[PDB]
Write a protein that binds this ligand. Structure first.
Ligand SMILES: N[C@@H](Cc1ccc(O)cc1)C(=O)O
Ligand SMILES: N[C@@H](Cc1ccc(O)cc1)C(=O)O
Ligand SMILES: [Cl-]
Lengths: 348, 358
């Protein structure tokens, strides 16, 4: 006789989720939303596959905390996306979590926990970005259960530096309906990202849930639309030319010698300082301007206002990591858009 | 549906975990073996017992009949060396990563390139109940996802997080809510810092997406796991079982938030250059630092079987009839006779360290 002190000894409690098929029906994806989602996946895939000379730009706040502040940011970002449509493909970074447990964990930013209210707030936000304004969005892929609530509204997915080697995330990447980007290792390792791209191109079996919320094993087809992201190491930056050449050499000896490179301009490449973000973009832009076709895009941590605060809170200011201003951002995107114009001039 | 599940071929609903636990009930003696294995370990992680925690067994269990004979052998020697060693059997149901060959007991229980997850879950769970109950040996597994542990956690005494998942926040959250000690292996480049960071993160409460006991999607609230440690395992082209590497980690633990983190050495995998013949030489070195006085060494990890070497099973004869008995079909293990030499030398090691602490 053992009094169930062998099971869930470290589980404070379970909070059952709303079934994804029901959340997808309560907050439905409008036709204009799915039009934006499919267009974002196709436009990004053409740049990844080498069929388009434009640059894929993943720009947005490090984390989304205020839905109304993010919806006003997207209206600014969709305007500039239409003006630079000939050279840039802009996908807004709509990350839900990284002080702040996230939008799915805490919708009211008051340190509570309402996982169901978080899913409705995050999905209705996703439905408004792709529908009300009409801009493609991308999120971070954290587990094998959350994507079942947002996959019909996502056009891009990122696997962080600390999960690129995770076999579970490589399996899930093989079953996601949008292009995936693998960041290099936390020490600057490029090889682990090439291994992730190759592994995710194969069919796999991962443990997820059905649309009704039932534990089930999933059979995947493989994701042939993947790329690597250079975000630097804990002690190094790899956005410079010698580092791109080092990555280009590693790709040439891999199983996918057509892999293109995206450069994170924030995080460790900018020493976590937003003022170095424009100077980092100038370097990669000049590499592109010289005619480097292996360079595919960039990542920009931008916001309505530059800087970072804590959690009575400033409007349009990030709460996590560090962002650049909007007046800064439009210059970064304009300077990059000219570099893309100069690249295809050398390709003519 | 040109936008949803465009790369999903099909779902296979799982039997609810409570139903499997009702079909393959955990015996009273099974549970008694599980709880004792957990506390026996934890006392070594916390520095309350100078014994050595041994995680020994095959790389993957493809033959339940062969595993049951190995466990009875392991149970006999574990009782002989109970004064010095705490032995937990390796009962890994899945070889991860590399796609060539077998896919694990869960996905392929018949060992013939099949897919039968519900039949594999019944076979795997029954094997766990027989090891903990019929023979009565603690067992440990690899923590791969946040759904499968709900099927075996009531029968597990130890969990392992691979080198490719130590940095993953998802597996750090899961470790914070598991009912047994967890061991984090260093990075695939030999980096020990990510292992200390994982042990620290898993000591706090977290939230992770899992399933209820009936297989329904739910978010969990964890209490925090303070029975975690690091596993020195090696790098892509290096070994870290030597005296230089152990003390580098020991000084790194000294600057962590908990200087009581003990070190376990993986005697196989990259520390043996994926060679079963180098496992005794690696353990012999580990045994010496233990016997010279080093209390930071808490245990070892050995890949062992009834017979040494390896084999393959992919084509031709259509299954188990062409396999050798007690030979692993993944990686490479030492024979049982070698394992007896290895455990007996490590036992005398724990003895002479105990004399140096009086
Ligand atoms: N619906 C997801 C695929 C998926 C399936 C099951 C999961 O558990 C997670 C994701 C997509 O279209 O991308
Ligand atoms: N039941 C597990 C904890 C757990 C909970 C939910 C899961 O989805 C997975 C694992 C244990 O006691 O160790
Ligand atoms: Cl958390």
């Amino acid at each position: 006789p053992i009094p169930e002190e062998y099971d869930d000894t470290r589980i404070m409690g379970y909070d059952p989720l709303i079934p994804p098929a029901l959340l997808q029906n309560e907050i439905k994806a409008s036709k204009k939303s799915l039009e934006t989602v499919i267009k974002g996946r196709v436009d990004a895939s053409r740049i990844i596959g080498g069929k388009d000379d434009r640059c894929l730009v993943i720009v947005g706040p490090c984390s989304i905390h205020d839905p109304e502040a993010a919806l006003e940011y997207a209206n600014r970002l969709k305007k500039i996306s239409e003006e630079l449509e000939n050279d840039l493909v802009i996908i807004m970074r709509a990350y839900l979590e990284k002080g702040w447990k996230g939008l799915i964990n805490d919708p009211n930013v008051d340190n509570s926990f309402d996982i169901n209210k978080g899913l409705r707030v995050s999905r209705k936000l996703y439905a408004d970005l792709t529908g009300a304004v009409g801009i493609p969005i991308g999120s971070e892929m954290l587990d094998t259960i959350s994507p079942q609530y947002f996959s019909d509204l996502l056009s891009f997915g990122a696997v962080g530096a600390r999960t690129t080697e995770s076999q579970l995330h490589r399996e899930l990447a093989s079953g996601l309906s949008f292009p995936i980007g693998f960041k290099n290792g936390t020490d600057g390792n490029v090889g682990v990202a090439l291994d992730a791209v190759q592994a995710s191109s194969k069919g796999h079996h991962f443990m997820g849930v059905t649309k009704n919320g039932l534990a089930a094993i999933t059979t995947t087809k493989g994701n042939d639309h993947c790329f690597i992201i250079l975000r630097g190491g804990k002690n190094l930056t790899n956005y410079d030319l010698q580092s791109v050449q080092s990555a280009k050499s590693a790709i040439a000896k891999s199983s996918n010698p057509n892999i293109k490179i995206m450069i994170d301009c924030s995080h460790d490449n900018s020493k976590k300082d937003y003022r170095n973000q424009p100077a980092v973009l100038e370097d990669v832009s000049r590499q592109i301007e010289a005619g480097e076709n292996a360079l595919m895009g960039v990542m920009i941590e931008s916001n309505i206002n530059e800087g970072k605060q804590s959690m009575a809170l400033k409007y349009g200011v990030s709460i996590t990591d560090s962002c650049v201003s909007w007046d800064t951002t439009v210059k970064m995107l304009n300077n990059l858009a000219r570099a893309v114009q100069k690249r295809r001039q050398k390709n003519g």
